[PDB]
């Protein structure tokens, strides 16, 4: 790509952290130069604090401005709780059910073994639990999970794989628990 | 033990003269402001039927952010950013079935500064039909992530690559995908 001129980056992050609905709220305003946070306002502290030397003059200056501090102190209500209410019904309350499929892997590394894949896709929110069972008994060894993959479009996916050495008659179950369903989803593979 | 986090994230980058303003909820974008068209762009279309945001407020913040960047550049005695190159992964959004529409996702993660060149290639040739992408999304370590998307019809005869260039890389990174 060329153009190796030096670059200089300034980032601001106003973070509203919500605990138990909006029972407890913490506002953390952060200023970041390049990759280093320089100064922050933490509503649990109630005034600006420098994080590095570069942020010292800003915290000193902003802390001398009474109206500024009063607005920042009330922002847990006028900003965080306000914005939480604006979007609650389509963010906090968004629930999209996973699509769950089970299939043997197209590539089978070992003879007499069957790598099974449980694909859990399209869901929201990210909190999910995916388990494998063999004849009804949970497999707590031999399981590989890709972990939670955020797709960038308000959906997630995950893949959970089990190496079996199956016998005819055995029944393997992938079980998914997620806030969008009241009972676990299960998909079975019969060896 | 937090349940949720909403972040208003902004940046300005020189000498590119590039700014961004977005809101994030639990790591997903709610909206950003298009700096050129000067309008609010909702990440899912329906959000614009449920809420509003005055885009001119973002432009006013960005002007302040540009001026502040200049202040910090001088205050740091012109210390520039250290490039951090991205990690790139390509995956589909659902299990692949022959001739069943799907989407390829190119996930570009853990990089800074927020300037990248991304191209989808099919059989080595650039493809743009139906592609889309996100703006630069924040990370807790202050690096960035980004997603590019390519709807496609799986086939045994096509292979794909996500080609990514960034200042922290000395050569283009080509992340490959083909029907298994």
């Amino acid at each position: 790509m060329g153009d190796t001129r030096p670059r200089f980056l300034w980032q601001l992050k106003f973070e509203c952290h919500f605990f138990n609905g909006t029972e407890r709220v913490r506002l953390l305003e952060r200023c970041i130069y390049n990759q280093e946070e320089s100064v922050r306002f933490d509503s649990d502290v109630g005034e600006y604090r420098a994080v590095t030397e570069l942020g010292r003059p800003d915290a000193e200056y902003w802390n001398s401005q009474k109206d500024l501090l009063e607005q920042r102190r009330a922002a847990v209500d006028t900003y965080c709780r306000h914005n939480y209410g604006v979007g609650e019904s389509f963010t906090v309350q968004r629930r999209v059910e996973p699509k769950v499929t089970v299939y043997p892997s197209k590539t089978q590394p070992l003879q007499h073994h069957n790598l099974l894949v449980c694909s859990v896709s399209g869901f929201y929110p990210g909190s999910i639990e995916v388990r494998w069972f063999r004849n009804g008994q949970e497999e707590k060894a031999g399981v590989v999970s890709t972990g939670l993959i955020q797709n960038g479009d308000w959906t997630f996916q995950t893949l959970v794989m089990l190496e079996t050495v199956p016998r005819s008659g055995e029944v393997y179950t992938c079980q998914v628990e997620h806030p969008s369903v009241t009972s676990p989803l299960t998909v079975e593979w019969r060896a | 033990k937090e349940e949720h986090v909403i972040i208003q994230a902004e940046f300005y980058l020189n000498p590119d003269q590039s700014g961004e303003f977005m809101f994030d909820f639990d790591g997903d974008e709610i909206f950003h402001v298009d700096m050129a068209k000067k309008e609010t762009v909702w990440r899912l279309e329906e959000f614009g039927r449920f809420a509003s945001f005055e885009a001119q407020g973002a432009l006013a913040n960005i002007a302040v952010d540009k001026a502040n960047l200049e202040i910090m550049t001088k205050r740091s005695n012109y210390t520039p950013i250290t490039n951090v190159p991205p990690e790139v992964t390509v995956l589909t959004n659902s299990p692949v079935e022959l001739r069943e529409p799907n989407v390829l996702i190119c996930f570009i993660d853990k990089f800074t500064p927020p300037v990248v060149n991304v191209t989808w290639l099919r059989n080595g040739k650039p493809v743009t039909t139906g592609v889309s992408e996100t703006v630069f999304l924040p990370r807790e370590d202050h690096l960035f992530r980004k997603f590019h998307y390519l709807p496609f019809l799986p086939s045994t005869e096509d292979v794909y690559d996500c080609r990514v260039e960034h200042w922290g890389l000395d050569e283009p990174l080509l992340k490959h995908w083909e029907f298994d």
Binding site: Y79, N83, G85, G87 | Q8, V64
Partner: peptide
């Protein structure tokens, strides 16, 4: 329902 922003402050000069 309108999202509200926090205003960015001018740094010390």
């Amino acid at each position: 329902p309108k999202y509200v922003k926090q205003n960015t402050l001018k740094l010390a000069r």
